[PDB]
């Protein structure tokens, strides 16, 4: 087949030496890479920018005439990634080279056969501060109709985290927005954990770290991200080939999803970043 889906809760992606490069989630769809050798035991695949090998034991062949394969499509205003059959995210503005309502396929969401996208927030250095003030960040809750969020009116805490730890506050707001549903997930509400800190795929709720209150959750997650990712050379969101997404989450499109939120917030707040 041309496309395969991940069967177990997570599966590893390996290099040609058998070393682990990353891991991806159940249901993820990988592309067969016809430029490298596959065998009965391992398939040469590509996912979210990463070219490696996966065990056939971890995969099920798809038929693209009847099974969902992730794709990109323009509505004539924004270009969307269908990351699941019933879920799309905006990743870029419409380009004149895009046909409205036509499905496009890409292993990285950057290179398409007739156009190339810039996803600047995906690769932005997260140690550079945002140009948004605390009050500006707080305005986006009303502008995006975000109701009953634990993160409402926390712009000052995000900017304090940025000041102390040197991590972009727009990224911190976007990461917490995406991963905890704007601080409305059960992990957010029960554990003040807005960033999926130690929320491992096997037992995400039980494994998730607990923080003392909302502010200590923002600051404590920022400390954890600084110490475990930024200080270890993972300084941008990225994908399965480079950046925080290699290790932070099994979801191949975690980085793209956070970059999409950054893009949405940035547009609502007047394009200062
Ligand atoms: Ca190696």
Curated annotation (Swiss-Prot):
Coiled coil: none annotated. It comes from the Bacteria. It is found in: Secreted. Plays an important role in cell wall degradation and cell separation. Belongs to the glycosyl hydrolase 73 family. This is Putative endo-beta-N-acetylglucosaminidase. The lineage of its organism: Bacteria, Bacillati, Bacillota, Bacilli, Lactobacillales.
